[PDB]
Point group: C2
Chain length 564, copies 2
């Protein structure tokens, strides 16, 4: 199950991962350094003696660039250099945690998306973009965030270990005491107060509900009240409920405050307790009294986040991780389509005993039979969801027929040539999705440009009077779908996009309703013109768009009739 993780992660990824591990432990040390360096600095900044015994300190003293006024000062400068240094080290560590997680999100998202773009058409189709978006987006977030969380978890569990070690070394007695005390407060808060608070909250809820209940009905009985004259009865009932509510409210609020108040007080108390019992055993009073206390204090506060991060991040390995890691293996060992080798289209697309059903699912056809002479311009009339869109989806490359054939010049369309067959159909979806970019792209669908092919295509789709009257011209961002674009231009742009692949079969998957019949008529006329040298299938939703079709088939549950 790490094999998963190291499969999903690249080489640079795995390396980066290990660097970040090491780095995590190293900052655990730099943390405990920052805490403990307070001990010697404070114990040597007072008392000034120490350079009067002890070989090392007096050796320093007799490096003589300074007396000791200036030695402690240099020591301070070294300390604030170190602390600045540590601030930088920590910033960089968190920045590298970000860099790792977000970079990995970028990489794994891209790998997953690619993986999806390669499954077969029905497979992609049969699940909702809600979930496919979740699959390449939310999951990748989870993995990323979680790995970073693990690294942070490491660094902090070592801060806890090292710091606890330090405390034990300096005064195992006190640290044992502080710890017993720690779990003691933990128990008091979480097992004695939290329940009382929670109840107080429920009491408040119920009392509020009841108060508002009879306030509301008293307001609803206003007419009956007004016809009594006297209002003392309801005011009575209301007073009683309002007192219940008020009371439960003052005690929920009262009890709520106890935990912080308790915390303030216990802090001071345990401090006094430490000095009153541990002034009975000393081992030198002086400034030393602050030396051993400060550490604990420091340590304790530094350990406060250590807890939280360790808790928080642990939860992140719970809620994410597990469920998620599999969802990559079982999403990127995902299988793709197939096929390679060509296929020619000069006579007819024959269909032959088609029959198709989606993976569920009773067939939509059974034994559909038709054929299309090259150039034929046909249309599929139908009762929408009767199967005509699916039919076209079979006639064009996508979707494997449950029973038919589909021959192209008497040659069977299948896995081996489907690439080359798919390659020869333009698409034109009427309700079109452009992406936010420079018209040229879309039209090219990314693929560089070709200026010439791009221009000839724009000319064909008669967008010429549009790309002339635009500021940036062919490079105008289209805002989204548009935003910058209106239906007619969107449509012509989609037509253009289709004509950039060029030939030889145009599908026109017209959407339902247009409320711009004039424009739809014009675009229809244009499309017919530009389908002169080509052959065209129309997934027709109207009629009146199909005036110029050589053939019209109506497909209804679940037979094909020729109409024309």
């Amino acid at each position: 199950m790490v094999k998963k993780l190291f499969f999903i992660l690249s080489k640079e990824d795995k390396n980066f991962l290990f660097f970040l591990l090491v780095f995590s432990v190293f900052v655990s040390f730099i943390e405990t350094f920052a805490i403990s360096l307070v001990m010697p600095f404070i114990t040597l900044a007072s008392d000034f003696s120490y350079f009067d015994r002890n070989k090392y300190l007096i050796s320093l003293k007799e490096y003589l660039n300074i007396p000791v006024f200036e030695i402690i000062v240099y020591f301070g400068v070294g300390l604030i250099v170190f602390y600045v240094f540590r601030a930088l080290l920590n910033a960089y560590y968190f920045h590298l945690l970000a860099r790792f997680s977000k970079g990995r999100k970028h990489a794994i998202a891209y790998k997953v998306f690619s993986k999806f773009l390669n499954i077969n058409y029905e497979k992609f189709t049969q699940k909702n973009q809600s979930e496919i978006l979740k699959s390449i987006t939310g999951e990748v977030y989870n993995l990323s965030t979680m790995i970073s969380s693990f690294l942070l978890l490491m660094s902090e569990i070592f801060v806890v270990l090292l710091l606890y070690a330090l405390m034990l070394l300096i005064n195992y007695k006190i640290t044992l005491f502080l710890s017993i005390f720690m779990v003691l407060n933990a128990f008091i808060l979480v097992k004695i107060l939290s329940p009382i608070i929670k109840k107080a909250g429920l009491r408040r809820e119920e009392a509020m509900k009841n108060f508002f209940e009879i306030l509301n009905t008293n307001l609803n009985n206003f007419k009956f009240i007004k016809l009594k004259t006297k209002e003392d009865g309801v005011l009575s009932l209301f007073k009683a409920q309002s007192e219940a509510f008020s009371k439960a409210n003052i005690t929920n609020e009262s009890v709520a405050a106890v935990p912080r108040i308790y915390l303030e007080g216990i802090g001071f108390c345990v401090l006094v307790f430490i000095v009153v019992f541990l002034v009975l055993k000393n081992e030198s009073d002086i400034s030393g009294i602050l030396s051993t206390i400060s550490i604990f204090v420091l340590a304790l506060y530094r350990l406060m986040p250590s807890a939280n991060r360790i808790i928080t991040s642990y939860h992140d390995l719970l809620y994410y991780h597990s469920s998620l890691n599999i969802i990559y293996q079982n999403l990127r060992q995902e299988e793709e389509n197939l096929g390679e080798g060509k296929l020619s289209f000069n006579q007819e697309l024959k269909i032959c005993n088609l029959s198709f059903g989606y993976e569920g699912k009773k067939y939509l056809f059974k034994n559909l039979n038709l054929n299309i002479k090259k150039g034929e311009k046909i249309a599929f009339i139908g009762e929408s969801g009767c199967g005509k869109s699916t039919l076209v989806d079979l006639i064009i490359g996508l979707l494997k027929p449950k029973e038919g054939q589909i021959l192209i010049d008497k040659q069977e369309l299948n896995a081996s040539n489907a690439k080359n067959y798919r390659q020869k159909i333009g698409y034109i979806p009427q309700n079109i999705y452009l992406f936010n970019d420079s018209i040229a792209k879309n039209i090219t669908f990314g693929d560089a440009v070709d200026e010439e092919k791009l221009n000839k295509v724009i000319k064909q789709a008669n967008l010429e009077h549009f790309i002339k009257n635009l500021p940036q011209g062919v490079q105008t961002k289209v805002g989204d779908g548009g935003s910058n674009l209106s239906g007619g231009q969107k449509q012509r742009i989609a037509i253009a996009r289709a004509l950039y692949l060029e030939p030889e079969i145009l599908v026109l998957d017209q959407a339902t309703s247009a409320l711009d019949t004039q424009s739809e008529a014009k675009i229809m006329d244009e499309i017919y013109k530009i389908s002169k040298d080509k052959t065209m299938i129309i997934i027709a939703h109207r009629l009146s768009t199909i005036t110029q079709c050589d053939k019209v088939y109506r497909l209804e549950h679940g037979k094909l009739k020729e109409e024309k």
Copy 2:
């Protein structure tokens, strides 16, 4: 605006308030005590001397009751006693703040609700119960809240004053230094980092948006992609947007960390700087001068919440107060109805030239004319919102006619007699709002009980075979409206409630639809029987339910015609 507050507050309210003021200041003292007491306790726990100098200490010493091992111990016990006391004082203080605010919500809500119950029927009627609920409930909450916010605001600005005074005494130089340091850092955060953070955030928002946009457009063009075969274009556009998102994400996340990291570093640094600049002064009393840093630390940390509380509560006086305080005076210097003195009903209710409109609002009638013989049992047919309900509202006490009269035994109904008139009509609304209580109340409508009158009335409204098969019976909570009750019992209990006032005019306001005759015909007959010795007005929504009526008037836009 204080005249407002003290108009709203009672005497007991004001007293409690000034008490809470004084108490607030007193806890400011005990807080600064809690801080400063660490100084002597730790300064006398080292060095053990002082009981050999200082007249007071050495006199205490030569109270000779113990050595000094034990005197410091006594001082310590005195401390944890003081700290416990302080915890108690604070818990009690916040409990008193709660007790005040909620006690005041309780009282002022009650005053407002009562105020509303006394305005005239049209006024109450002409506004939505949303607003009347908010006016006696949400506003009251606001005021209460805001007063407590103010008391805490006091307590905390005084904690700041006193503590800051302490710091100044202990080391005027240092406190000035740290204050400069404080506002300096504040400028760093709030004016140097925070803007960078927000930009980083907006950048992330935008890059995210673009990433997800072309991801979705790409998922939406899957059919077009699959028909290309080649997918490198969309994968490319996707890579570019995804890298943008990645970059903006890592640097928003990176910059997010700088502020706390900065805070850590600057803390330690300013500490070291404090020891290095203040070891430059021939005074390093080993632990003595070194005692005084701790105070500053403590104080600074105590001043943090004071800062927060002062901000929060200031904002609470902003958001509320101003807006809320006024909407009280202007909600309780509100004027009420009027009247006192009687009016007798033995022959006819004469109506005469009515003409009525709601305050808007074109009239519903002009010249309505009818009269009701005592005992008559009449019904108002109409096109439901044709005005019949408004008409009844005028015939009974509520609503002042724009032009008519309404005479009761040739005597005018008006402000002087309206009370006694209202007093003599029961109401029975068919679709009735009960409150959550012991069926006796509802039926009595709060007003104590009378048992004999209550039992007789229960028998009148034929509820006896229901109160037989009930657990608690007449004391059964009826569960919200019911819940515990089904339509028939609601209707009969309403009839009871009405008969409990007793006489002399029963209004029956039938709802639209009952579906159908089975229940409603039955209750109609029960009602007709019990309306024999009385006179009755029925606001009929059908027909067919008013067969047994002596008179029936149909009122339609906007004249009154007699039918039967």
